[PDB]
Design a binder for this molecule. Structure first.
Ligand code: HEM
Ligand SMILES: [S]
Length: 142
């Protein structure tokens, strides 16, 4: 399910993306929005009706990339701690469900992120495994 090597690659590659997140965060969001238009739709409120092509350098974009980074960092720091993962996962799921976001959409986001992490030395198979363990804690609450 999740080997020691897989955890190690996830933690290391995350430390590298994290040091670059000021520029990489918005690029990840754009990759996601281009791949899934239905995902972009859920942010219409935050972006005030603006077209997708115009959002990358907005102050809203910047805040949203910082939000994303703070939860991902928490999860990566607790890979050997199922109890801690479950708690964060529950809050996360409750807040997103309340917005009418589906388990399928969350899953799409983890897929885009696993591909994106190849740039920071991430093993896509290690990122996919981590996503499968997290989704197993989230799905039951969606
Ligand atoms: C790996 C998957 C995801 C991560 C880490 C993530 C993380 C977060 C966090 C930490 C927040 C701010 C805390 C909160 O109010 O909930 C958040 C906000 C939000 N997320 Fe996500 N999320 C992801 C997936 C999504 C997905 C796929 C969508 C869209 C379909 C999305 C839509 C939103 C929106 C609409 C907000 C509220 C934005 C605002 O007005 O401040 N999130 N997400
Ligand atoms: S998000």
């Amino acid at each position: 399910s999740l080997e020691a090597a897989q955890k190690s690659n996830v933690t290391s590659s995350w430390a590298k993306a994290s040091a670059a997140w000021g520029t990489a965060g918005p690029e990840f969001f754009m990759a996601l929005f281009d791949a899934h238009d239905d995902v972009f739709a859920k942010f219409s409120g935050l972006f005030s009706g603006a077209a997708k092509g115009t959002v990358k350098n907005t102050p809203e974009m910047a805040a949203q990339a910082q939000s994303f980074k703070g939860l991902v960092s928490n999860w990566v720091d607790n890979l050997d701690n199922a109890g801690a993962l479950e708690g964060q996962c529950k809050t996360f799921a409750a807040n997103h469900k309340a917005r009418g976001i589906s388990a399928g959409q969350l899953e799409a986001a983890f897929k885009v992120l696993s591909g994106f992490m190849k740039s920071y030395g991430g093993d896509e198979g290690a990122w996919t495994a981590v996503a499968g363990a997290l989704m197993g804690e989230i799905e039951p609450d969606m």
